[PDB]
Design a protein around this ligand. Sequence first.
Ligand SMILES: [Fe+3]
Ligand SMILES: [Fe+3]
Ligand SMILES: [Fe+3]
Ligand SMILES: [Fe+3]
Ligand SMILES: [Fe+3]
Ligand SMILES: [Fe+3]
Ligand SMILES: [Mg+2]
Ligand SMILES: [Mg+2]
Ligand SMILES: [Mg+2]
Ligand SMILES: [Mg+2]
Ligand SMILES: [Mg+2]
Ligand SMILES: [Mg+2]
Lengths: 257, 260, 257, 258, 262, 264
Amino acid sequence: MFVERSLNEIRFWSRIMKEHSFFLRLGFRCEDTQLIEEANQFYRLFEHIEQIAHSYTNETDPEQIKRFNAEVQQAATNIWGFKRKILGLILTCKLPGQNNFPLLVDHTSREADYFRKRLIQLNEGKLDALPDAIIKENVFFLRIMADHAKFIGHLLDPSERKLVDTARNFSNDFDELMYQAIDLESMKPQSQTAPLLDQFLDQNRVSVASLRDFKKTARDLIEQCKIKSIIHPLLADHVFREADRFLEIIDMYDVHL
Amino acid sequence: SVMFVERSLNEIRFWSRIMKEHSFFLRLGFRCEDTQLIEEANQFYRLFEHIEQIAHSYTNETDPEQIKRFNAEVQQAATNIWGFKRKILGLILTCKLPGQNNFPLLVDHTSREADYFRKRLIQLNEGKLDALPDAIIKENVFFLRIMADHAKFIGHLLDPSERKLVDTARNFSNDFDELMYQAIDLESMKPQSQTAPLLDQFLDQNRVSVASLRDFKKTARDLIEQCKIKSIIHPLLADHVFREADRFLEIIDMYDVHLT
Amino acid sequence: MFVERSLNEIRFWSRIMKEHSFFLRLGFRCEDTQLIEEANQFYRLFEHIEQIAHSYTNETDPEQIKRFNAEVQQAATNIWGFKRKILGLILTCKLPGQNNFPLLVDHTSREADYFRKRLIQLNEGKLDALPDAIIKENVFFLRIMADHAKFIGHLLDPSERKLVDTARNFSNDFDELMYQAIDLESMKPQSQTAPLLDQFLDQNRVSVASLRDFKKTARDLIEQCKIKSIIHPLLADHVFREADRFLEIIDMYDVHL
Amino acid sequence: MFVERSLNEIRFWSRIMKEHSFFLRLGFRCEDTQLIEEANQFYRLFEHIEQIAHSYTNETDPEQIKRFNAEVQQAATNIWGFKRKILGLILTCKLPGQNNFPLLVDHTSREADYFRKRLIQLNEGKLDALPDAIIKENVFFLRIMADHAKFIGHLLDPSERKLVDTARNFSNDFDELMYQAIDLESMKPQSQTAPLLDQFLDQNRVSVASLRDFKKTARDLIEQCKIKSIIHPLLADHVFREADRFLEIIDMYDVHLT
Amino acid sequence: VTSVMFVERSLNEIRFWSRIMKEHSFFLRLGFRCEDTQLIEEANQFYRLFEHIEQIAHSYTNETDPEQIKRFNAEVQQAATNIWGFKRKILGLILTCKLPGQNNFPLLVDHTSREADYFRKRLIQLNEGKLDALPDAIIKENVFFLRIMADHAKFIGHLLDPSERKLVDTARNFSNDFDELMYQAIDLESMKPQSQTAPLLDQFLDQNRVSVASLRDFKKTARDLIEQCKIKSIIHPLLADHVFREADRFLEIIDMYDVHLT
Amino acid sequence: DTGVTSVMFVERSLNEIRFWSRIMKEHSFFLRLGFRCEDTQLIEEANQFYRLFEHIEQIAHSYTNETDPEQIKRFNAEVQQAATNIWGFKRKILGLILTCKLPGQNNFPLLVDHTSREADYFRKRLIQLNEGKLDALPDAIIKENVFFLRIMADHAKFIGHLLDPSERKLVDTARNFSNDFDELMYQAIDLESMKPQSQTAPLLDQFLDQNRVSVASLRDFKKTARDLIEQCKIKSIIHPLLADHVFREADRFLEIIDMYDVHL
Ligand SMILES: [Fe+3]
Ligand SMILES: [Fe+3]
Ligand SMILES: [Fe+3]
Ligand SMILES: [Fe+3]
Ligand SMILES: [Fe+3]
Ligand SMILES: [Fe+3]
Ligand SMILES: [Mg+2]
Ligand SMILES: [Mg+2]
Ligand SMILES: [Mg+2]
Ligand SMILES: [Mg+2]
Ligand SMILES: [Mg+2]
Ligand SMILES: [Mg+2]
């Protein structure tokens, strides 16, 4: 259902790109003034997109929404190229002193691209059949979960030994499920049977729910200032919502099967 | 031009032998009632053995045009064995062959190796070999997975009573899992991650690991040849994975030099 | 009670022997026709024996059973001898490309032996004092438990990382209980105090009950084609019953104590 | 030797405090304008101190060296206060968005406290006798090493998995050496025998050597951009130089013990 | 009222650690060589001294005249000092290898004397009207006790028969777990007074309590298994009980402080 | 080659008695050390065993390869009764500890049982000698490794447990050896079950090979720890003579491994 889904995607992901520019900005060196401005530009861009998405509704004219999709797709492409650009400066050591992790940069670029791609599937009636969506969403989100588990463990203060270790065991849980998901993807279309796919979702579910439960707790502790970390609480909430979205997808794909 | 000829003969002398051996290994995994599948495997064995013989008869003086035609026929043999491995996998995954003995990972593994070969031939035939930074990343992302799978197969095919070597295999298994992920990340970070320093460190880190597995596979192979250890690894399988490890090592050293 | 016991043993173990003959035949190469024919021979002979034991009842003439015992006890000596001949051929590498694990072969042979000597026990009335019994069965069966955890781990498709790992944890669990059993053994009969034996039995039960559930779970998943393995739906059922059986014995030993 | 040792200590630790000033400012948010310039002030104070230290010689009037020590002591007290104040802002979440690890702020404050305490010992004639120094230096420095291994592992890009895991193994190695150090410490003066302290120095030396070498290597790969991290090259050379001084101390205690 | 709280606290402190110092006297005597008779005799007098101090501590009441309790604190603190000196003398003898054959872990001797020292310093706090405020109490007590629980896990693991592999593995896990909390506690402590926020202190207590409760259960079960003869060890049943009571003490303190913080 | 694997009746006898008599004598001291001071029956009974094996060791050392095979044969049967006696004593002690009849004593039950296994092995070896039934090489290889890999795995726990827990590095090293030999022992058990099929020269050669690297390494670790204890350089409750006692036992296992390797 094109209008339904378009707006869901955009409401969620544009909040994400908006938040991304804030985080990337926090990690720029103070003197990198052009990059700080770009970041602020993209901040307001996606902020604006966000407001527009919320002001639409299921009863909005499909054509108007197709144009919005096309427009949001172009913003998703522009934040993407911006992230790449930062990645190349960091990776060539052009920004000594800077505090963006290359992996987080690449990470946020993959989500931007997940976003632009989804918009194209929508505007093209090229959504995926259930067998393909189960594999591709999982292969995608399981890497994203594994990434978050490392961001948290890296941004936790090293004195927080027990929570650093807990995030470490989540970073290994998802490293390993991502690999099962990579194998399952190579064995397609042969792997794409009812019983293999149901088991695959079954097994991912218990972890994601656990991780989601963990990001929530972590978020509340950070907000209450109960732990030591360089984790901005908006970041903690952000990865919580990404986890929570993965879990909804997993649960709805398990209903469709 | 003559170097198109070298490179095609090297690729075929190596991978044709691998495709022929795959046919043997897969058939060894078949239940004794699967005569069609068994006979199909034997056909592919005969086919690639014959492709291998031809490839060792041609030479660096051979007409580039007859080499180019050999490539397209060999590339079609590759497409077909790939097609056949895919059908075996389908069957395993739907439990059509209860009692069969081929790991589905092994069936996808060898089928991945047929695809590698397929695409290399096309690359040569079009004169479309990758630039150094893409080759490096592409060859490794692929071969590090292969080494990772090897280490698992060895570990699963060793007899559970050979605790020390099973444990060693699992340590290798763990390292190449780790190296594949580093390569998946590099790959995602490309072209930004394709700088001289990053790629030299990537290859350096890989080389120490690959040479060590290479040595373990050889030592394993010598032991299985003399019945010094307990397993269900046919000696030729031990030799096969040792050869593919050696191949990978030469390629890394190749690129290492091209860059350094 | 000599009769109920014999038939219980024979009804259970003959099926185990029938089943080995079939598992072994699948490791045999297609060229190895004499081995295949002999294995199908032991399959047919224990199946026949299964059938005979399901026809008898606790009413049956003692002597007609004391001689069914000796019959069957010969059949178990013979299958034992055959699993041994397979072992020798495997260990000197005269059958390259076969798919039976030497550990598997020595393991069937140990089970086969166990049966042989139990029948002897039943006919000689040399059945074990309770303290000696608890230590003997547990040593034997813990080891069987420890091998099974390995066979499961090795015969699962390597792409089943989560499940391979679970089997490995069990494997280590049971190696540990066995080494504990072994030390109690050497400490016998000094170690054969009621509380020591009661603590022994308690520790082992938690693990055996775990693994039993795992096996049941795994079997159900392979039957349903939910997981990637080269474990036969029958083999999984086979180790489940041996697990199940061992738990019966443990529970009964705690009761008589 | 009062002058020698003062100058040695000052030349080393002044560069260290100057470097902290730089790392701390990198961790501040851009609107933290007063923090940034307070950091830049210490940067300068200590560069100047470093310059003066480097221009005096073993032959300088002890009375001027004594006064320099006292001047340096106060500078070290003030940056220690500055470090603590920053610790307080962070721990009460007054600075969201900032990127200085509280552990790192605490750690640099512990280094400042060490510097300042060594200047007092110097000026008072109250340096430790050997068996006390051995235990005290090691208890202190082994902790410095455990932290550094954790800072390295955290500041490494998460995708640098082999290097992340090597750093963790070093963190684990040093936690364990530090706890051994803490029990020896509790067991003193009884544990202060030549044999126990000889073996202490020996166990410790080998991981300090490996760690120094890992730091050298990390520094060189970062300088050459061969790996991914958020570790300024200078932070790499810095911890490398703290590892090296610990190792020089171990070697000189070992010589004295023998 | 306030004098009554001085008295209550003094007698709680003394009732508890007088028992501990006494038992330590026994434990250490058990680990001496049979030919070390002067040491054994000296251990035997300390047992008897704390036995009597414990007796008197249980006969005094909350109604006891504070001046007398004060005099009692001072004398028992002199006894604490004296057994500390003894424990340290022994540690010396061992670390200079002069008792080949003895069976007391030097870590244990040193552990016992840290508890002797704790007891001696609590009594001076009580007598001088100088108890820790809540923020410092919370950090000083956990720092002390976390090290104690860590040591205990080690002793259990070393004193279990090696054939008890599962139980040795649980002790060792608990040991690792408490090394970890101890080291969190040492970083919190260095970050004081900045780290002394109600929020950071509440989480510190919560995180420690999960562990201490869990080890407390374990030490009780182990104690019962040993009294019942169900497991193989060289752990005197009383020693198991002793370390259970110290865990229980520590869990009390965490609850009383969680309460007073909330 | 120092006689450990000799098949000459006299030489092998003296070698075995010289070595194991000293071992049992030292067990008599170690066991005594773990008794409560009030258990004087035990203390006295241990001192007597200490005295017996001390005596036997001096006599073994007085005999030569030239001594009359009839004397040696009677000596062996005496020494064999002695070994049966100390074995029963150790089992008695074990029984007392397992019924918790001695609260506060310090001998591990695994240690007591382990000393009774070394005793039983002395026992059975002298019976082989007198009856003329030393094992053929493929059996000796399996049987000795199974016995001695267990001895080695027990020792690395004895060291693990008797080191002060504040020696974290060394206690961790002990544990790694302990796990290695657990694993080597379980390999031998399987090898032993798979016999006589497994007794091929290639499988026994690999077995010994793998066994050797761990044994030489534990041997070296035990010599090093011995020297650190004599010097007072580490913290433990390991008597310096216990450290040397388990070094001599590893060392002998190493001769056996190296000599079997040659013969093989
Ligand atoms: Fe995001
Ligand atoms: Fe291949
Ligand atoms: Fe079976
Ligand atoms: Fe510093
Ligand atoms: Fe205590
Ligand atoms: Fe011994
Ligand atoms: Mg994300
Ligand atoms: Mg391959
Ligand atoms: Mg079985
Ligand atoms: Mg530092
Ligand atoms: Mg205590
Ligand atoms: Mg021994």
